[PDB]
Design a protein around this nucleic acid. Structure first.
Lengths: 149, 248, 49, 308, 98, 147, 49, 235
RNA sequence: GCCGCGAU
């Protein structure tokens, strides 16, 4: 993992958005890693196009009509090579993805629906007793640095 | 310094300074505009009988204080009728449940209440108001990094914020790109539209490392490679902290 | 004077009576003590040195 | 009483991904060896990475060269990821010259004597006109761990001319490593453990050599535990007193009071050496005169006094 | 004292703050200086005087034969903004208030 | 998944809505004044909120049902959010209720209380109206703390 | 008020609250052991919960 | 430069009693103190050859719940006392011992019948305080050499309940390591300021010095790597 | 020295 954060900061400030965004980021990176694995072995365009199409329409009555039937072949390859890092999904402000959609997206990428995986201690090597939520959070580096203070 | 129930569609209820100036400084909502005299107005969709139409009326405080206004998060049929016979509404600075025919106006979108600063927070409805305020006021202090990185999860509002900020180079009337360099982009316009006589091509001189007000860097790198068609309003160079025309 | 100011972090290895000080923040607050101990041990004779 | 693990069934999935099997292992040693080897392999593995780059027309990393698509910053970031294997040398220079249209890849770098580019499809820059050329020299070294460009100053022991763009070095080839333990296929024994290590590197180091190096490092570190056991400086001082150009009536008096070094004379406060017989008021000022000429003011306080 | 201690403690105990009663009583003692004299005989009459000064004066007079000179006083209760400003020394109370 | 939603929340929220509709009919009948119906609505909403809080807390406390050497028993839960609440590290009963149970009646425009409460927690979303309503209390609290 | 001001809080409490809790069934039930030394040894060896 | 690592120098040993030791090693490269400490602790705790009493027979009733014939200490306490007894047997895999005491007075570990091939390191280790008053106690114990720590999961020996009643499934601690702990602290050398220093606290039941146990763990772990360090050897 | 912005 790249950042370790204190759980005791969530249930007292009521940023459930943190946890939901973390689960959603894990789902998006799972889809991106699946696409990257498909692209590494240079599979044919048919199955890659089918996977992209099946990934895009997932949802519950979503107002998104991206279809790759009208998409050019080299354009499809460019799209895959562009989002190989992760499918950049977006949720508008007050009508977003519910837990059902997030869990469905996680299940598409062969990931636990609960969003929590088991972790091992880096130094001792013993498994952590409880599952831990591992996800991707978008972090900002603020302009209050040290050398200026 | 308090949130008046008339701040609904005109002034953001979340974003504001914290300590001294709490509530004395505001940020306009995303759809709010100014009347001829200078009173804030917000747009609504007209309701005729039980069907909602696509006509948009701009209403001020006084005019909206009399009608009955529906809610954006209300289920809508295929043709335009309200699915439910009872609809949540605001009558006069309040809220209640009205009949399917008693409504007069409908909210246009769910982002109307909030400004543009707090519209880029995913899952805003799952945050406490104080923490949303802190996040909104702290997103403005981020610094541009070495390599811009798109957000893996967002609210789609990145495109408008990035393009409209004037920090990116958008092709005004471009055709097909001809010469791409680390500092210059020369585009040859399409045959369809020209100014008669003397022909013409578009030349954009990107601004390289330049001191900003807070002693940060301002940089522009092209995103088009060569021979790439470019439509009107396309994004050719991304300024500081923006990836392919998306705020990052 | 003889005063400094900086951001604080957490140290879980510390004892109840210890605090970590940046060695760049020291060597400024304790400069006269360094001068005295240098002139004492003979590394430098004059104050300019 | 303990079976000795052996290296067997080593296979490679790709040019980078590799799997290594250690079939004979006892009950608890699988996890211990796995974690120790993972930490050793991730922490300190010798490798080679680009140290510095000199481009013909640039002056600093924040410039733009005409005819290329990328800034010099992005070129340096691209070069930082270059993967190259060297043999018998540690300061090898790589030159790259190309003129034309299109991407310029690692395969264009001139073929050195003993230098292997693990991947040649690694694009580093793009040339976007017919008459633009790129000519650059890369000095690549051999190292152990991550060393920032800023933290190295010994490279400035010799003054570097303007035009030398210093880049950070990584030196670590092992990008990722995981281990696993399974029940062995041996049926004669009651139950045995088999350890499987998967490593994804940049291709610079062979997997088997990496496992051997990690084992040797662990053994060398254990060699300490295999046997516990264990159960007044500045040149101006330390200088004889017979050089201050002193008078005759001072020399005999100076020797009479066991003052043989310059330093012990300095440690004499004014009010006390006047009690010396036949010191002389005018003479004492002369001692103060010539001693202050060296900058040693009378009355200094030292800590310890060596006899030499 | 019991009146003031009990009511001011209700504010702190309601929100869940524990503060010992000795700290409140110290403030009250500083609040009960500057007694007013209701009699005469020792160069004091119908005036506000520090209780400490009055106490040493009566003890001195009572120690002597003229025990009747000791004059009965009337204690006062001023505000902490007024009591802090009626400090005998003028360097203090001129660095805090008007 | 730690914020377990009580299953009986919807049943009793519907019961409260039915009672509110009945009292609105009574007000329309004219035998009740505005103050009486307002106060009765406030009281019944408080009762329903307390019942939701009790239901969520009971479902979260002994939620874990782990078998023993014989048959099955029940103990105190190991839920991480409940572990944080109970141990006294961070959180409290009110915050936990706001996360899972109903948010509850709230209003601070001039000190009064809106008749309709916030019936959605933070595990689910909020409508625009509910967020706008909570903003009153947030801003008032921030200004009071500052001043 | 006389209450101790330096007190464990935040993760520290979760360190002890998690440590001093019991489960109706875990690794090792009704086991008898000599003392705290054996308890630590059993927990570290992975033979008990 | 490359393939040259800091070796710890001037190790310090503080000895408490004859079984407690604190070993301080410095300097170790970053990320090595933790590795060495964990490997040594895991080896010392999980697999370390040693001997401990494992089977107990008591005259009278043989049930797990026993009246203890008025021996003023429950048979559970007797088994717990017998768990911690430390012995030294040379060259025999399994050995049977017998103890028999009559008369008022606590019994000690020295009461066992004298035999040359097993030595007792704690002769005054109390087992019981006699059967109250005016009675006798007879115990037949069986001690075998094992590895690490083995609990009383089940007998899985002999047939039916013969072995469980013949041994009473006394929990055995084979490894003579009562407690092992390791800490890593910050230390600096010359210009470097990020180095790891190891503090090992080791307490043993006896029969072996803590330094000897550390040496044995180090030797077995080093010999585990002979197949890889043989050809890739400096010498 | 006066505002304006900002952190706790």
């Amino acid at each position: 993992v790249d950042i370790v954060l204190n759980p005791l900061g969530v249930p007292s400030r009521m940023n459930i958005g943190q946890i939901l965004e973390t689960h959603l980021g894990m789902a998006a990176k799972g889809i991106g890693d699946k696409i990257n694995a498909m692209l590494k072995q240079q599979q044919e365009v048919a199955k890659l196009r089918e996977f992209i199409q099946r990934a895009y329409d997932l949802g519950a009555d979503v107002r998104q009509k991206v279809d790759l039937s009208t998409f050019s072949d080299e354009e499809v390859m460019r799209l895959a090579e562009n989002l190989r890092k992760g499918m950049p999904i977006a949720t508008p402000v007050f009508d977003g993805a519910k837990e059902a959609e997030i869990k469905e997206l996680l299940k598409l990428g062969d990931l636990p629906t609960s969003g929590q995986i088991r972790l091992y201690d880096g130094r001792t090597g013993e498994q952590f007793e409880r599952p831990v939520t591992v996800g991707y959070m978008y972090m900002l580096k603020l302009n209050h640095l040290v050398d200026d203070k | 310094r308090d949130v008046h129930p008339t701040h609904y569609g005109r002034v953001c209820p979340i974003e504001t300074p914290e300590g001294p100036n709490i509530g004395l400084i505001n940020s306009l909502s995303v759809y709010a505009q100014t009347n001829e005299y200078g009173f804030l107005e917000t747009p609504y969709r007209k309701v005729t009988d039980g069907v909602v139409t696509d006509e948009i009326h701009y209403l001020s405080a006084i005019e909206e204080g009399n009608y009955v206004i529906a809610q954006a998060n209300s289920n809508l049929d295929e043709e335009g009728h309200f699915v439910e016979d009872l609809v949540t509404c605001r009558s006069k600075g309040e809220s209640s449940l009205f009949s399917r025919d008693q409504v007069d106006y409908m909210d246009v979108s769910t982002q109307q209440v909030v400004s543009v600063g707090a519209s880029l927070i995913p899952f805003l409805e799952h945050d406490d108001a104080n923490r949303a305020l802190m996040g909104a006021n702290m997103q403005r202090q981020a610094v541009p990094t070495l390599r811009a990185d798109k957000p893996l999860v967002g609210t789609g509002m990145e495109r408008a914020v990035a393009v409209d900020s004037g920090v990116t180079a958008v092709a005004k009337r471009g055709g097909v790109v001809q010469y791409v360099d680390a500092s210059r982009i020369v585009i040859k316009v399409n045959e369809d539209e020209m100014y008669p006589g003397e022909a013409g091509i578009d030349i954009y001189n990107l601004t390289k490392y330049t001191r900003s007000n807070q002693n940060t860097c301002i940089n522009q790198m092209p995103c088009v490679s060569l021979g790439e068609p470019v439509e009107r309003g396309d994004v050719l160079a991304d300024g500081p902290s923006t990836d392919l025309g998306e705020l990052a | 004077d003889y005063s400094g100011r900086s951001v604080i972090t957490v140290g879980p290895y510390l004892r109840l009576h210890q605090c970590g000080l940046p060695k760049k923040m020291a060597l400024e607050l304790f400069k006269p003590f360094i001068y005295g101990k240098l002139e004492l041990r003979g590394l430098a004779t004059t104050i300019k040195a | 009483e303990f079976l000795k693990p052996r290296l067997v069934d080593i296979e490679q999935v790709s040019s980078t991904h590799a799997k290594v099997t250690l079939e004979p292992l006892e009950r608890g040693f699988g996890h211990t060896l796995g974690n120790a080897l993972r930490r050793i392999l991730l922490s300190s593995m010798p490798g080679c990475a680009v140290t510095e780059v000199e481009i013909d027309g640039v002056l600093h990393e924040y410039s733009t060269k005409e005819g290329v698509q990328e800034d010099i910053l992005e070129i340096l970031l691209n070069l930082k990821g270059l993967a190259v294997r060297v043999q018998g040398k540690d300061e090898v220079i790589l030159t790259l010259n190309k003129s034309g249209i299109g991407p310029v890849t690692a395969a264009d770098i001139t073929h050195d004597g003993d230098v292997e580019i693990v991947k040649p499809q690694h694009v580093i820059c793009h040339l976007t006109d017919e008459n633009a050329s790129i000519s650059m020299r890369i000095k690549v070294q051999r190292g152990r761990g991550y060393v920032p460009a800023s933290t190295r100053i010994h490279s400035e022991e010799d003054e570097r001319p303007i035009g030398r763009l210093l880049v950070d070095a990584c030196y670590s080839p092992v990008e990722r490593i995981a281990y696993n333990v399974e029940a062995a296929r041996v049926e004669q024994r009651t139950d045995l453990d088999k350890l499987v290590i998967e490593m994804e590197t940049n291709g610079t180091i062979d997997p088997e050599e990496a496992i051997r190096r990690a084992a040797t490092i662990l053994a060398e570190q254990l060699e300490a535990f295999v046997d516990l056991r264990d159960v007044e400086f500045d040149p101006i001082l330390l200088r004889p007193v017979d050089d201050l150009e002193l008078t005759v009536r001072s020399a005999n008096c100076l020797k009479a009071e066991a003052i043989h070094y310059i330093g012990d004379l300095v440690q004499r406060t004014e009010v006390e050496l006047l009690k010396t017989p036949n010191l002389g008021k005018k003479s004492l000022t002369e001692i103060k005169d010539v001693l202050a000429s060296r900058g040693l003011s009378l009355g200094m306080r030292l800590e310890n006094w060596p006899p030499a | 004292t019991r009146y003031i201690v009990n009511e001011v403690q209700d504010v702190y105990r309601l929100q869940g703050v524990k503060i010992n009663d000795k700290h409140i009583e110290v403030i009250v003692r500083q609040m009960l200086r500057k007694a007013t004299i209701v009699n005469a005989g020792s160069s004091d009459f119908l005036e506000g005087e520090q209780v400490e000064y009055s106490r040493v004066k009566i003890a001195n007079r009572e120690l002597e034969a003229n025990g009747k000179v000791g004059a009965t006083y009337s204690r006062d209760l001023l505000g902490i903004t007024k009591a802090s400003l009626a400090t005998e020394s003028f360097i203090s109370a001129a660095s805090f208030q008007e | 998944d730690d914020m377990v939603i009580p299953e009986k929340k919807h049943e009793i929220i519907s019961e409260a809505e039915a009672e509110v509709a009945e009292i609105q009919e009574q007000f329309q009948s004219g035998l009740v004044t505005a103050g009486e119906r307002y106060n009765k609505v406030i009281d019944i909403w408080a009762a329903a909120n307390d019942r939701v809080s009790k239901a969520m807390m009971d479902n979260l406390q002994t939620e874990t049902v782990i078998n023993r050497d014989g048959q099955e028993e029940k103990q105190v839960s190991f839920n991480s959010i409940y572990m944080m609440a109970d141990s006294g590290a961070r959180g409290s009963a009110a915050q936990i209720r706001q996360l899972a149970g109903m948010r509850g009646l709230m209003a601070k425009p001039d000190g009064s209380i809106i008749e309709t409460p916030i019936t959605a927690n933070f595990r689910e979303g909020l409508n625009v109206l509910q967020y706008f309503i909570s903003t009153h209390g947030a801003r008032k609290g921030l200004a009071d703390t500052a001043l | 008020n006389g209450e101790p001001i330096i007190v464990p809080s935040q993760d520290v409490v979760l360190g002890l609250y998690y440590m001093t809790r019991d489960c109706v069934n875990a690794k090792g039930e009704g086991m008898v052991l000599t003392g705290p030394k054996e308890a630590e040894r059993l927990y570290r060896s992975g033979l008990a919960s």
